[PDB]
Structure formats: C-alpha cells, structure tokens
Design a protein around this ligand. Structure first.
Ligand SMILES: Cc1cc2nc3c(=O)[nH]c(=O)nc-3n(C[C@H](O)[C@H](O)[C@H](O)COP(=O)(O)OP(=O)(O)OC[C@H]3O[C@@H](n4cnc5c(N)ncnc54)[C@H](O)[C@@H]3O)c2cc1C
Ligand SMILES: Cc1cc2nc3c(=O)[nH]c(=O)nc-3n(C[C@H](O)[C@H](O)[C@H](O)COP(=O)(O)OP(=O)(O)OC[C@H]3O[C@@H](n4cnc5c(N)ncnc54)[C@H](O)[C@@H]3O)c2cc1C
Lengths: 467, 466
C-alpha cells in the first residue's frame, strides 16, 4: 500500500489564487471531479479536489509557481487515455488539464512543420494537416481523445511507427514548464540544429515527472498520394512471420504499417462491436498498409506480393482496399480491439517488446496456464516493431489470477531480454517492475535527473521511477 | 582562453596508465603532434599524453584515475570534427578510441548492429553491406570518422533526408562517466518505454557528459536500386522548384537532395582535378533515390526528368545506377570541403535556414565583401534546410572576420535559424549559441554538465558557454 507523501493540501486561499491565475478554469464540484479522477481502464480512482484548465503557457507557469511555493503536488493530464495509471492522482494531487490548450500556432506548408499547444487532440491535428496535404507522423486508436502533449510525454508509438519512427525523431521542439514555474523554451522549429544538448529529449517519455509540455513543434510527413490496405488470414504464426519477411522484401519502402491479431481478437470485435470479418476464419490475421507517391507502382508491388503470399501458402484468404471508406473499415478491426476487450470484462494488460520469432509464445502458454479462469486471452499488435499487446479478460478481477500472471509474465520478458513496457510507459502501474528491463545504475541516474529538475517532487509523484 | 586549475600528469600517473592500458600510453612528442591539431589545421593543443584503450573497462579505470587526480581528458575519435572539439586547448589527456574497433554483434534479420565506439564509419558500411544492410548515416568523412564521434556530435549527413536523426536510429549506448561509472543503456530493442530515455542526453553531447564506448544502431535494409541524377539548374528559383517537384514525383524513394553553386564546381575542378559531367550552370543538384523495385524507380525518375527538362527547371542532367559512376557523381559533392581548404583560408559557417531563403546570405555576402574575398560559396543539404556557407581568402584577415561576424550569426538569428546545423559547438562556437538558444536553455545545459561531470574534467573549454 502506497503512503501519501507530506505535501500540503488545497485551501480556499489556494482556490482563490487559482481563480486569479486562470479565470473560469477552476473546477471544484465533487461530481465533476469524478471522471478526471478515474483512469481509462476504470480500475483506479484518485481523490483530487481541484481540476485546473489553463489556456496559456503563462497560466501553467503561474500555477506551478504557486504549487512550488505552497508544496502542492500536481497531476498533469491530457486526453486521459493512458493505460498505466500515470494520468490520474493517487491521493489529492491537483489535476492540471491541457484540454483548453488546443490552439495551433503555425503550420509551414513547405517544411511540413506543425507548432501547436499540448492539448490539441491528435485526430483534430490530423484533420488540420491533411487539409493541407500533410499527415501526422503518428496515429493510434486513442486518436479521438489523446492530446499531442500526452503522446510526447508517454513517447507514444502507434500504427505508423514502422514508417515514420519515434517521437524522439519527429519532435522538433518543445515548450516545457518546470516544477518551479520556469518556462523552458526549446521550441526550435528547425529540421537540424546541433547547438548544444538536445534538452527536449529529456521530456519525451518522461510522463510529466520532469515538466509539463505546453507547446509542441512536430515534423509532419507529406500526405501520400496512394494508400492501400490488405487484410489477410494466415494459417499459423510461422506464416505470419514469413508474411512479414516477404512483405518487407516485396513492398519495401512503401510499407507503412504491419499489424497482427489472433482469432480471439476477431471474435471479440465481432461480438461486442458487431464488425464482420471480411476474410475466412483463420487463427491469425494481418493488416498491411502501404503509402506511396505512385498508385500504379504501389498496386503492382502489392499485386505481386499477394500472388506470392497466396501462392506459397503464407496467406489462406485476403482482401484489399483503396476506397477511403473500405480502408477505414479494415483499420477498425485492429484499432477497436482495445475497446472490445474492455467491454468483455476486467482486463489484465501487458505491453511487451519480445523477439519477433517468439512474440506469440506467451499467449499460447497463458491460455494453458490460466484455463477457464480467463474468459479470454489475446495477443495482437505491432509485429513489425517487435511489440506484443497481451491481454487477459475475466468476469471480475481476482487475486488468484493476478498471482498466476505476475511475476511470470515479467520473468518471461526478462528471460528474452525484452521490455516490460514497450509503449504505454511506466506511470503508477509499472514503476516497481523496471528492474526487469533496466539496470540499477541507469535507474539511479534517472532519480538524479528527477531531483535536479523537480527537487520538491510535486510533479506526478508515485509514478515513472521506482519507490 | 585561460587554463583551468587541473593537475599535471606526473611520472606516477604515467605508471598508473601503463598498468591500466599496457602498450597504449603514447608520450613520444613527435607522435603527439598529429592528434593535437584539428582537421582544419587552425587549432593545436599541447597534450603530452595519448592513451589508446582497447576495452570499456580500460576506459572506466582511466577516468576513475583522472577523476581522483583531477586531470582533464579530451576524448577523440577520427578527429574530423570541424569546431575544435576534438583536440586539447592546453595539456588535456587525449583519450583515443582508435583501438576500440570491434563489431560486437549483428542480427542479420533485424539489422541491429552493436559495435565499439572506435569503429570507422566506412568500415561499418562495408561490414553491414556485405550482409545486405546499410548504415543509417553517411558523411564525406566516412574514411576516418568513428561511430562514437558521429553519435557524440549527432552527425547529420547525406542520407538524413531518408533515415533521419541518430536520436531516432541509435537504439542503445554504453557510456563511461567522468568518475569511471559505466552507464549501461545498451538496449537493442526497437521500442522500450521503461523510464527516461537517458541515451539521448549523450547524442550530441560532444564528449562533455561521458565517453561513448559502445553503440547499438538500427541499420536500414540495403536498397536493391540506387540511382543518382546530377542536374544543372539555371537559377536558385529552379533549384527550389526542382526540389518541390522531386518530392511530388519521386516521393518515398528519395534518399538525398544536395545542391552546390557554380563556384563550388569550379573549385573542385581546380584543386581536385575532377571534371564536371554536365554543361556549366549557376547551380547543380545531386538527387539520390533508393528503392526495392528498380523498374518502378526508373519509371519515376524518367517522368521526373522529362518534366524537369521539359519545363526548363533543369537545363542538363546525367544519371547513374552503376556503383562506379554513382561514387564519381557523389565525389563532386562530397569533396567540396576539401577543395575549399585548398583554396586558401576558409571561413566556415554551417547554418539551418528556411529553404526558401537558403541562398540569400550567399548573394548578400558577395555584395557586402565584393573584392575583399577570394570566393563566397553556398552548398549542402537543401532538403533539410542546411546551408554550408564558406568564404575563402588567400590569407586570413581580421578585417574579413569583422565583416563576417557577428553579421552572419545575426542574419541567421533574424531567420530564427541555427548557427550550427550539423558540426556542433566544440571550442569554436561555444560563445555564439545565444543566436539560437535562449539563456534558460543554456543554463539547464550547464546544470546537466555539473551533475554528470562536477569536476569538469571531460572536454573543458567547449560545447557550453564560458
Ligand atoms: C484505444 C486506445 C489505443 C491506444 N493505442 C496506443 C498505441 O497504439 N500506442 C501507444 O503508445 N499508446 C496507445 N494508447 C495509450 C497512449 O499512451 C495514449 O493513447 C496517449 O499516448 C496518451 O495521451 P493522453 O493525452 O490521453 O495522455 P494522458 O493519459 O492524459 O497522460 C499520459 C501521461 O503523460 C502525462 N502527461 C499528459 N499530458 C502531459 C503534458 N502536456 N505534459 C507532461 N506530461 C503530460 C500524464 O500525467 C500521464 O502520466 C492507447 C490508448 C487507448 C485507449
Ligand atoms: C570531409 C568532411 C565531411 C564532413 N561531413 C559532415 C556531414 O555531412 N555532416 C556532419 O554532421 N558532420 C560532417 N563532418 C564533421 C563530423 O562532425 C565528423 O566528421 C563526424 O561527426 C565524426 O567525427 P569524428 O569521429 O572524427 O570525431 P572527433 O572529431 O574525433 O570528435 C568530435 C567530438 O566528439 C567527441 N567525441 C569523439 N569520440 C567520442 C566518444 N567516443 N565519446 C564521447 N565523445 C566523443 C570529441 O571530444 C569531440 O568534441 C565532416 C567532416 C569532414 C572532414
């Protein structure tokens, strides 16, 4: 059981200070604070008594200045779609929301450089840049709710990572407010700049424990002229792996996504979201996207790829689409898996990097190990990046099932020299299992970084680093 | 400017170093001459000790000793850096990675390379290309630069347009801190969000925060087809429109877009005796493509050239897919920096500017100095907004320096640009970062330096302001 650290509490005088700093941006009604206190999975509830919703970087600076002087803990929050308990308070930390920091500052129609506030919603930024023939360098199933500042803070991966890479590469600059309210200006909207240390990198993946991101400068790829999606049934995981290998060999540079899911995933999306499968029933499914400049060439590459995959028995049934409507329908089958799982019951969630050759082994194992105690066990995700999403559903949480899952799943991953948190990050849930993926000396340097940047520890206590 | 109060190497220090790295203690004064002079040959240190460790543990024991004794250390790779970062200012110990040159592993499927910091870039390219992979970066200094130095300087280079930053392609680092502590961030995972991305601090840290000893890096697959078009353009408006059309018509196969002006071509012909393959033009553009289907690439290139030649964007062009002729065309661009240093004294600027006004400073400087310069040239990575600006003179003039500085830095700042796009900061640029970075940023940089190396023994006098 975690113990509340000796922070102060919010007084009426603090509430009047916040009303001065952000007029109309202070929410205190207990019924209104219910939702922002509960995480996306609905298995964690905080006891925060104040939600602050600033509009500007200066307002965030003044809020944190006040909290630093008063020794008040702060819980940054974006879209609240995070999966690891980082997004809601543990006790009574002030919820500092970016919901109203949702303005675009500038967009350069030649460089493709976007500069916008941290609370812009990913899907809305995609619509904005696509109107100008660019795309966001990342996409994820949470796009409708997650904030760009949240994506940077968690170092979100997602569905086009294989093509455009990490936020560590695509973020050009950040504005960050530090714990004492210092505005750190690293908002360098330049493709290249080697003038000292890359300070912004510290805040990518730091999950709001080192500062609050208020403005983001991000490189947007050009919008592809041609997008294709193929959705394929494979008769086993070995054929999934050869379909991936063959796919890289025959599609090459136009590959923009490679996702897999198992039969149980398909059944749950069908059962809870009523989405019919467009291919024959198979034990594994694969979604492939391509993105390129020449429709004709991409079609020829894809045509030959399918022919060879179908010819050599890697794929048993497959369908292809270019019409935007049909493309979105195929993508829904993968994107909405996470929703279908949470409608199925209580979800035990694991987000692992493993050797691609052994990515599905743990799923087969756990189906045997838990038996009928698990309502379902699934494996899916970013196979091209070595990333498995392992989930177990049950009618209700149980201590018996948790004891079967942990530490067994984490030991498997360490045995494979894998990551116990591939993309979702650490937050509250995984803060004490980092030893399975990171050595002690690295963990200590992280602690020193935290002490340097937030010596009072008012920013997101109880998370990201070990206790 | 003035030597900080570090200890001096005694006879007992030499004997300690001989125990730690037997055979790797060079004290011969004639042998120390070359490692004390930077690549441009305008800076020269007075170090009397060169250490050549073989392993990471040897590096750790050296720094433990240097930390206890308060001796300054100057890490050195291939010594091709351009900003005086790689050579001592006074009598700093030169720690060379020259002997840290082994490949440790290479996964033939994932393309993940683990190697020691002193592996030469050219040699790593050879190694992974024999296995159908390529390095994610390439530079004109490939023959000499070390992968450790590339990571320490956050090198950009000639295929950055396609594969992007080392901040993205580097998967893991082993770093030895100033006190000897071995920091293990040598993960080989594509995705790992288990805490802070500590390795990122050392990419671009220029040896002031730790010595990189091992690098893990993601190698892209080797392309089936590489094409190079070397094109002559009748003006910079056409250079910019050739770039725009190139992105629309070549797209995802594009792997390089470089430009150079007429004077650059003249200088490589004069000093290096390399002939131009196209008609004389005011500007030249080198376009590279890399793709998986050679026929699709050739069709894309065909339609692009036809349109560019047809619309007057390009006047004359030559294409190559043969490896020998591709290197010939590339040599015309890669060897400009060499041709300039043979033209006389070189004033060198490496700027990030809006692409639409990348060449304006070249035109401005030509009017501003007129006959007081020998040549003013502009070339470089136009696709990434990165201009290499050089002025040559028959000899150095404090006058010409006063005309160039601060003027060039102020122009760049007026464009919200970077006064060092690629080459970094080192000794030369430590006091001009204010044109690209605000004081609060520079202050936090100093706080990180104080945390990781409180004694300041690693690379004094560089990277951060005085
Ligand atoms: C359906 C679904 C699909 C998903 N798919 C993916 C996927 O493919 N890949 C992936 O990586 N993740 C995925 N996620 C989780 C992912 O982390 C979030 O979707 C997103 O990255 C977080 O954005 P947010 O604004 O919701 O952040 P929040 O949940 O609000 O917060 C995330 C963390 O960052 C901190 N934080 C938030 N905003 C800021 C800020 N401005 N400055 C500093 N710290 C801040 C918070 O305190 C918290 O610790 C998915 C989630 C869902 C529900
Ligand atoms: C012809 C030519 C072309 C070039 N082209 C480019 C180009 O296109 N793009 C570009 O970005 N640069 C370019 N450069 C310069 C570039 O910075 C270096 O060539 C390259 O980055 C590798 O440097 P190096 O191994 O020679 O390191 P050095 O010059 O030896 O060292 C550079 C700096 O890094 C530090 N350092 C070196 N090794 C380590 C280590 N293991 N750990 C910690 N710190 C270390 C040194 O202390 C120093 O501050 C070019 C140089 C030349 C001569």
């Amino acid at each position: 059981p975690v113990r509340r650290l000796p922070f102060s509490t919010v007084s009426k005088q603090d509430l009047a200070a916040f009303e001065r700093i952000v007029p109309g941006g202070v929410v205190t009604d207990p019924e209104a604070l219910q939702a922002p206190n509960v995480d996306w999975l609905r298995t964690l509830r905080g006891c925060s008594k104040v939600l602050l919703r600033p509009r500007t970087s200066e307002e965030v600076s003044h809020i944190l200045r006040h909290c630093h002087e008063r020794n008040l803990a702060v819980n940054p929050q974006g879209g609240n779609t995070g999966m690891v308990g980082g997004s809601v308070p543990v006790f009574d930390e002030i919820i500092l929301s970016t919901a109203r920091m949702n303005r675009v500052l500038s967009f350069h129609s030649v460089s493709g450089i976007l500069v916008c506030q941290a609370g812009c919603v990913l899907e809305e930024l995609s619509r904005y840049v696509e109107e100008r023939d660019f795309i966001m360098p990342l996409d994820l199933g949470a796009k409708g709710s997650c904030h760009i500042g949240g994506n940077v803070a968690t170092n979100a991966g997602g569905l086009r990572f294989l093509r455009y890479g990490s936020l560590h590469g695509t973020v050009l600059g950040l504005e960050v407010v530090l714990a004492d309210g210092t505005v750190l200006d690293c908002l360098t909207s330049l493709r290249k700049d080697n003038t000292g240390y890359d300070l912004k990198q510290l805040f990518i993946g730091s999950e709001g424990t080192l500062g609050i991101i208020t403005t983001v400068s991000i490189l947007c790829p050009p919008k592809p002229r041609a997008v294709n999606v193929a959705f394929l049934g494979c008769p086993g995981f070995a054929e999934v792996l050869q379909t991936f290998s063959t796919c890289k060999g025959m599609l090459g540079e136009i590959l923009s996504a490679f996702e897999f899911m198992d039969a149980v995933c398909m059944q749950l999306v069908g059962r809870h979201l009523h989405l019919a499968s467009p291919v024959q029933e198979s034990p594994f499914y694969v979604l492939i996207e391509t993105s390129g400049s020449n429709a004709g060439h991409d079609a020829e590459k894809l045509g030959h790829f399918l022919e060879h995959a179908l010819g050599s028995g890697l794929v048993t049934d497959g369908t292809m689409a270019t019409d935007q409507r049909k493309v979105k329908m195929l993508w829904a089958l993968r994107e909405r898996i996470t929703e279908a799982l949470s409608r199925d019951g209580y979800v035990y969630k694991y987000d692992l990097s493993l050797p691609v050759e052994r990515l599905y082994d743990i799923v087969t194992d756990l189906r045997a190990r838990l038996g009928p105690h698990a309502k379902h066990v699934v494996g899916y995700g970013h196979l091209g990046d070595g990333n498995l999403h392992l989930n177990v559903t049950a009618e209700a949480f149980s201590p018996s099932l948790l004891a079967a899952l942990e530490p067994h799943v984490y030991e498997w991953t360490a045995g494979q020299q894998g990551s116990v948190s591939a993309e979702h990050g650490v937050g509250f849930r995984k803060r004490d299992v980092l030893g399975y993926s990171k050595p002690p000396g690295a963990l200590q340097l992280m602690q020193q970084l935290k002490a340097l940047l937030d010596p009072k520890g008012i920013l997101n206590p109880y998370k990201t680093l070990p206790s």
